Design a protein around this ligand. Sequence first.
Ligand code: SF4
Ligand code: SF4
Ligand code: SF4
Ligand code: SF4
Ligand code: FES
Ligand SMILES: [Ca+2]
Lengths: 146, 905, 568
Amino acid sequence: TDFLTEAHLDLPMEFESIGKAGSRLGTALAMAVDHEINMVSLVRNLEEFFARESCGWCTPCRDGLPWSVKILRALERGEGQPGDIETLEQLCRFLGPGKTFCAHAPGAVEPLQSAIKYFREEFEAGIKQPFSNTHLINGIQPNLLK
Amino acid sequence: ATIHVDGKEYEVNGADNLLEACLSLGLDIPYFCWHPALGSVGACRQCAVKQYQNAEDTRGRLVMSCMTPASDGTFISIDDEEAKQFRESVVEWLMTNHPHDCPVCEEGGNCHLQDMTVMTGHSFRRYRFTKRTHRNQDLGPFISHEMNRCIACYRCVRYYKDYAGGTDLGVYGAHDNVYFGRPEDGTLESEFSGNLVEICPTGVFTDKTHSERYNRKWDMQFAPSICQQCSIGCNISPGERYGELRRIENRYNGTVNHYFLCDRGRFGYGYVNLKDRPRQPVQRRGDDFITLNAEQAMQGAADILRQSKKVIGIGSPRASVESNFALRELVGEENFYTGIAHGEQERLQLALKVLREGGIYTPALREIESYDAVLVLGEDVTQTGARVALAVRQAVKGKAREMAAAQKVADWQIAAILNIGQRAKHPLFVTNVDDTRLDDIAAWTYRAPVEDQARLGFAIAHALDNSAPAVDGIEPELQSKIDVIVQALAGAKKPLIISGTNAGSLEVIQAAANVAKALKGRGADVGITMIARSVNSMGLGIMGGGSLEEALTELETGRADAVVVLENDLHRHASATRVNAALAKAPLVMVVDHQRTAIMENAHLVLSAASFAESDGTVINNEGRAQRFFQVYDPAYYDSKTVMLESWRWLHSLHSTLLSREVDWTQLDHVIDAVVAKIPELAGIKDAAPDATFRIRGQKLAREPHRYSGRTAMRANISVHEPRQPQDIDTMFTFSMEGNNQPTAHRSQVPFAWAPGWNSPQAWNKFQDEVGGKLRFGDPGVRLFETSENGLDYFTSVPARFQPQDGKWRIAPYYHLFGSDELSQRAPVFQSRMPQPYIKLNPADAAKLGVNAGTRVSFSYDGNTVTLPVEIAEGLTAGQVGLPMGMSGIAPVLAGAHLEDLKEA
Amino acid sequence: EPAWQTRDHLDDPVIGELRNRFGPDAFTVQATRTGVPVVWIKREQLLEVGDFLKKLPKPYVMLFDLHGMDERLRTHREGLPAADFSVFYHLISIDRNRDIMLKVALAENDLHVPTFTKLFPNANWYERETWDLFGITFDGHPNLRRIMMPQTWKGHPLRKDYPARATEFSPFELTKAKQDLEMEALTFKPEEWGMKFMFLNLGHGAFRIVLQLDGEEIVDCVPDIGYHHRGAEKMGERQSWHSYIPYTDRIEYLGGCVNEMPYVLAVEKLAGITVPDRVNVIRVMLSELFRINSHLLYISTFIQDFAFTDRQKIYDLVEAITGFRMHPAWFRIGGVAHDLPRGWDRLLREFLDWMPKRLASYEKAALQNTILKGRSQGVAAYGAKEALEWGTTGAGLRATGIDFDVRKARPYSGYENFDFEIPVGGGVSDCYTRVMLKVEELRQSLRILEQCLNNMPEGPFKADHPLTTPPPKERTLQHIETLITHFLQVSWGPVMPANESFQMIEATKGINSYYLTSDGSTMSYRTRIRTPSYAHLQQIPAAIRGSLVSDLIVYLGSIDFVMSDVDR
Ligand code: SF4
Ligand code: SF4
Ligand code: SF4
Ligand code: SF4
Ligand code: FES
Ligand SMILES: [Ca+2]
């Protein structure tokens, strides 16, 4: 289920009330996260669970949840690179209902998109190194894209 | 129905899903997990389009076109930006763990994943993390395994398990460590495992025989040919390179063998590449072997044949219709002998009479899959006619298809079909001397001698219709199982009766004809299918002639002083001692063949015939469909000393030099016209393919792709000067890329599938009228005979019960897919695949002999004591001894023959 | 809005004028990526449409091109009339700075079009070549004979059912051709060649002209061309889009990258590729270097009728950049093959510090040499009327006072960013006027090179498009998607979706243009190359009438043609 802030705490625990806030009522067993818990570490743990409890049937969950897991590990270690948060956002948009074979992956990407929506500063604080995907090959001049 | 794709209106079938409907129209949607023959499961999530609710809808919703029905008034968009971005994202997700292997990958230039990576326009890698790896398995001699390249699309398991009925290939593991393969290292046990090299859209399963001598698809010279390995007549695309046959790809024929071959046809081509094949005419002189060219061989053979008082011809069911006809014209109709045994010919002629005079429609191979009940009498189909066994498996799954169709479930939603049809299936009743490979799906299996199987068939026929002859001496439990078969066949809308000449019993064929006639008399839509032995058994039976024993008597009595043997080793159809004595007695033996056979030691002249890869011709399959196979390459292009002509060309020029003392290398169409003039029954071979003057808007048909490479360096080691392009005057194809291979070309003979953007075997989608259906502008090949207006009579010759007498062992035939076809045995990759020759014994017979499993026993047949190790066969009945037909020393003529003096060695 | 977008050009005023004149159902407008309106005209209305376009308020005055096309194998004919063959006429209006392409559809058995030589006299050789390579007869044509093939040639080589490859060589055909060519001077027939007084054969390139002389005066001359026919367009149908770039190089061999440029721009129109600015600057720089080289050779050859060291400096610079002197084969679909080597700017700076003194020397050798002024002025001259009707472009057209340069009128490859002038002659195309225009063009190319050197973009040398062929090499060597794209692009070929594209550029001899038809495949369905040397060589019998043979030699030396450009 999506994370909610303390401003959403004054809200009845009904299906339509939580749904209109941008979440799901779910099993109505709420979990409270205090201030000293890092949001990136919490979502990293959640995505590790969701990416190892995938059944492996369909490509977006099977091959896109581990990519989000690796990105969140990099953001944990301060080894994130520019474009990682954009990759997480695109993964959240492309693992929604109907894109994947079952509803495991929408429920997987709900905490990620909610924590990006409400706690974006920590994910941006995870990015501390320039984007490098290649290595220089001696003899070949690279294509310096702008 | 009516669909609106990107603002354009199309009329499609409403029973189709959106992916196959749009692919039939020519719209390009990427797809991985969907296959036309396997249905839709929605795994790979690659086929995404945007479906709108109505015409004035702007938001839409991303759906999978393979899982979405093509209902009436359906508005979708393929080239919408969100759909394109999602499809590119799916390609990128597949690319995150994919290895950097394309230069060293056998599927490169042939890879559906390459084509769909390019088609979605994904070329920039922004994933920077580690790629998951995997360890490979050893899958045997044929299929190479490379699990790194897997995109987890489940095509292999769906084909191999749900379609092919195999049991030793599954998916293991979890979230993204999914693994595909066997539970342990070992050979894949399916007879149709070789179709994985085209089912898999990546390089996980590759053709290991092609991998040992590898070249890319653009370097291949392809031709449309017919598989020569059994009688079914599956269309193949043999591709060569550097003068050797490199690969057999499947050639789509929506009537016969649509997407699938068997492993014999796919991997038993290696006899063409043997280094002991005849390549020049060789004439013996005392102990010397003088090599002649074409004209010297023809003049010398014509002189010696002119001096001889009577020359007889021995054809073969391996040779084409044209070659057997040319031999018949050379020696005369009365001096032409079909080079098969008398009992084999009698069974073949009876099967022909049933097919073209029994008044019952004989189905094509794809049409077999639409029948509601199958009775297989005597024919071990999986080892003799394997594609029919695959079609029978589909016809058996038809009951689950029907049950799901009752609940308004679409026919492509295969997972729901298999869920509804849990273990319910259409009735299958197989009879054999032992256990078949169809026993896992058969409703009942009858292990019995051929007399008892024929008696069971006659009892079924009598219980279906009392006008049929009755069978006396049926046990009550066997009678109850007879009643079960009768209740299953009488309630079936489309019953199918499959028999053949491989059981070695005339009465099995008679019983099958009786069952089919009894089902026809009740008004059922019955079909019958006979399985012959060789590629042109049916054509040689139609042409006719004497048996091999008659020709042996002619040679032994001295009435024939010259024999021309065409593509016949002569030991598979008669005893080797008698053949050797008759051929050593004859003062002139001339052997026209493409394989080094044992009778070439007794030959005065050996003419180097061409195999199917170096010759054109026509063969008739088990259903009576004339099919033209075209030459793949010129053998003289790389080696200028090679004189390897067609068998009909050798024999026609020999006839011309015999009559007029001048050599006439004729054309293929002249021989076709001669066949359809002299033999009216074979008049349909004229329409099997168009003649050599056929053009597509003025230009010929190309044998090789447009990007064929090395054209100025492939022979540069011999000479730097390029030779002439080989002229093909026999057929409409050309030996170059200067030709036509467009998917929208008005032709039926397609050498290979290639379209721009589609380099894989999924390029066949562009060459069909609708995907998974007929080939566009019709499938190649024509049926020779129509269904007769009136049928046969009931065969009243009911055999007695099999009785085991002491000192006489009835030989029960055990056929093997790898080892019972002669040219397949010659292929070196089958040596590692074929089993060791075991002689099968009942536990009671081996206990009476005192023999245990593995002790070598000797038996004498035709005064030849041969020893084989014993395997205990429980399902074999007592008094019978099981032998592997076709293997080393054991001829198929021994099927049903008695055995004497079976002692421990 | 992209410049490669498929447009219909229904907002062109010529379409409305044609609708008002012939009616809306008299023609079919085709949406292409050529950048011109493509109008399918009925065969009977062709001369009427030509008359109407010749008499517009700002008329279409130059037949830029005329050629055939075999449509029998084209599968994507959506929105086109049913045609087995077609003939396209590319007409240019300079007052409107526009152009139109009229296509005439033809059935396979009725292959005859009315002649266009009454309207445009330069259509003579184009119709001869269309007859030669397609078998399309032109009714009313004076001498419709083969222009690229010998007269004893069977079949038409650009038809789709003609074998492209060389057939088996035979010494018997060589001896027969020797007997045919070596008895021409003895058994000459002065009616096949279009003539009707002594007959001479002469024997930039080697080619033969049949001359008819009254004493030493030339009263009739018929060029015999096709001796250097390489079948480059038929090869365009045989190579992929990527592996045809060397063949574009080998046409007008003094041009090099200049000849590569219109081909890659047309393919990029087919592929929908907008190249980045550094690609545009690099391709402009190399085309200007090769333009300077060609102008230097032309000036040195004319002055002959010291200058070969500057050509060596240019060749050393191009060798450093590309790796090859005169056939660099270096432009790619979506960019160039490699990046500029580290140290190129030093070589260019040393070249531009060497050229002003040499250019002053050339101006002293051409202006102060009044013997050359006397022997060059008035030698086979023509005005703007003769330049328009014969399709003369480049230095001759601008020497007739018509200010039409492609780099300014229809700018390409980022020539808008460069400040350079277009030298225009007084109104008479002398040899001297054309040579002076070449000198001033050389000065303007030096100015363009200075502006390139002083302001060089730092960026990519290949586009960020999926159809950029090949992809950047380092990403090919370490990324699987890029490796896959490289694998499929260099082997099967890049797939251009089915369209027609056209690019016209200013070559070193005039206006060069590629017209590419893609049928959705990895090769070209049709490649049409319009070269200016063809139209320049057609104008010789219209200008050298009544002149001396020495005047013919000087005029041939001052045309600035190459024979491989003629016979393409
Ligand atoms: S989204 Fe569901 S069906 Fe797809 S892989 Fe994940 S758990 Fe399996
Ligand atoms: S499976 Fe396809 S994409 Fe993967 S390495 Fe092989 S050719 Fe390349
Ligand atoms: S092994 Fe091949 S067919 Fe099987 S899931 Fe992987 S990619 Fe698909
Ligand atoms: S079933 Fe017979 S014809 Fe078909 S591939 Fe197998 S051996 Fe060949
Ligand atoms: S092809 Fe439809 S999801 Fe795989
Ligand atoms: Ca042949």
